[PDB]
Paper text:
The mycobacterial membrane protein large 3 (MmpL3) transporter is essential and required for shuttling the lipid trehalose monomycolate (TMM), a precursor of mycolic acid (MA)-containing trehalose dimycolate (TDM) and mycolyl arabinogalactan peptidoglycan (mAGP), in Mycobacterium species, including Mycobacterium tuberculosis and Mycobacterium smegmatis. A detailed analysis suggested that MmpL3 is a TMM flippase that is absolutely essential for transporting TMMs across the cell membrane. MmpL3 consists of 12 transmembrane helices (TMs 1 to 12) and 2 periplasmic subdomains (PDs 1 and 2). Our structural data are in line with MD simulations that indicate the major conformational change of the transporter is located at the periplasmic subdomain PD2, where this movement can easily be interpreted as a rigid body rotational motion of PD2 in relation to the PD1 subdomain.
Numbering used by the authors: 1 to 350, 382 to 757
Amino acid sequence: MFAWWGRTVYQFRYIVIGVMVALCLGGGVYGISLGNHVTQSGFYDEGSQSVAASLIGDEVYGRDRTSHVVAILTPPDDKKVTDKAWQKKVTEELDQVVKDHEDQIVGWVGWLKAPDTTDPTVSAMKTQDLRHTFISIPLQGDDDDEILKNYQVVEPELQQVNGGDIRLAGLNPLASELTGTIGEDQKRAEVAAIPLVAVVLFFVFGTVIAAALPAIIGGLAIAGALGIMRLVAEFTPVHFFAQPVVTLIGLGIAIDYGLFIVSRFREEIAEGYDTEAAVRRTVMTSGRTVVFSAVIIVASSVPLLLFPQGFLKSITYAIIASVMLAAILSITVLAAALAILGPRVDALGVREEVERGFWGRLVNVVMKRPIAFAAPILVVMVLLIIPLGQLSLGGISEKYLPPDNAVRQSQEQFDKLFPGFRTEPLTLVMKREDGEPITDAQIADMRAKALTVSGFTDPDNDPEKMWKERPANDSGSKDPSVRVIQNGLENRNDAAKKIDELRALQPPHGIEVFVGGTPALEQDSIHSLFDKLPLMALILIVTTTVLMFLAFGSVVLPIKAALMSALTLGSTMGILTWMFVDGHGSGLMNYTPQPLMAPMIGLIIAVIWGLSTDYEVFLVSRMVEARERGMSTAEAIRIGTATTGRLITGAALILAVVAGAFVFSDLVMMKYLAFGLLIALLLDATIIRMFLVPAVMKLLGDDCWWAPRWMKRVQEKLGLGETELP
């Protein structure tokens, strides 16, 4: 197989170098148009019942724009707010803002337009102290992103009201700073880590071209990845955290892939055959190695397709495109580029034997007492997977930002004087058939059915006042064919129980019950994730194990690899749990202990499983190819793992630098992911490969291979069994 590829690839070097760059610069420049298009809202499971209830309710009554952006006004000099002067000034400023930006807002409404009101809806919104009062601004928008952009437009003067000492609250400021933190963090990463990423791999090489090549190809790969998944975005909206994660994954993985091939080609040109033969056997081995690692990681990541959450789909598409394009980038153009480079690789300039001796003696002292080198780490790793039991999960909120932040502080201050204007109630949608008003008793009978259960919010202290109709906006389409009511579950820890009891309620004659609302919206997501988790885990195990069995003929290695990766996964996620849901360190790292998001764990399990498995197979490719040189396993272990230690450690440190750069973020979730990758890589690099692979490898003796031939022949006739060089 791959001999044909080498024999045809040294033929075309200049042509390939031209065409690949000429066709990928299109995506490189096309990524800006991706930078234009952004979506933010999709986090909930699209196919559940709460989303359908919300959709039909939004159809019947429209959307309520009272909670988009909220400003807290405080008067200078501590003056009675009921005066005329300061109120006149603020109304002047606000109606000037209203007229100046017509399309963004509808206007302003609240207490401050009511001099002497009677109804305790806006007079009671004024604090008894009369030193803070909030007045809301509804925003005209077609959908979510249009509203967010309109609020971004109206930022300057709407924040520059009076002296500028009024604070802004609501969902829109939170979303705006959430999406601004992503850009700030991306700028910080691309300014800080990239120099370190380049110089670390430069020092281990002391070379110009050999150090520049991994970055040169990683940038092209990520540019193509954004181009491809933007082309996808025409058929499916892509979320905005797809911007930093594509960097976070692709940079490291593409640099790793290029680094392996560069190292092999250089170590083979320097010692063995000439340029062409060395590069063709270099592709012979490393091209299939990196291709197998890429197919393993895509097979491990595609199980995320099960979850219907949109941003998960976007992340999966971006990462699979990134890695499968980096694979073909590394195998195709790199071989020809190095072949035409020839002696120019290390000629640019600015230990070998001592380093190989240190590695060999470390391996031998592992062989001194391999079981004593594995039992303590085996015990401590389960000791580290213990703390996952106190795990708790929840949705996104305003506490996902550092407490020192201005918008978070303002939102927290909003509830200091306004107790119950920020409510998240549970909704009961109706299901009417005829389309004209059938009966007026249905609201009463559903009220009684809800009354069959106790433990709910009865602030009015009236048996009937509970469960009132939703405030219907005039712009909505009032179809008398579906009815919505609302009220709030008090303690959101009993939200699951209340939702279960309410969904179990009687659906009346011709009436079908629905349960919407933000608690149900954020609970159906976690329920769907926990229901689709088992098949996700089953495929993540089986597909990866079988696929990595096809790389090399042995069948024992997949078995050991499966539980070597799964236990590392458990250990790193347990360390993350003990660190975050308990906030151990927050005090110093400026975040808050809070439950993690539902989809983040589902993403992280798959991604770290893929990373651990691919790093392990990168290490063990030499381990398995060394034996069929006519040697036994005792020499093969050292032969495989001696020269590999120089390069994988540098690559691991590169990904560690990228993750550490992402650690300095503001959002808690990117901190979660970055620490997860740091801990998983640090474990699998420092301790796992260094005292666990040989520890079980020698203990398994020469039995390590024991490959049945009835499947070994199938392994052979795929053409990819060429693990021996002539």
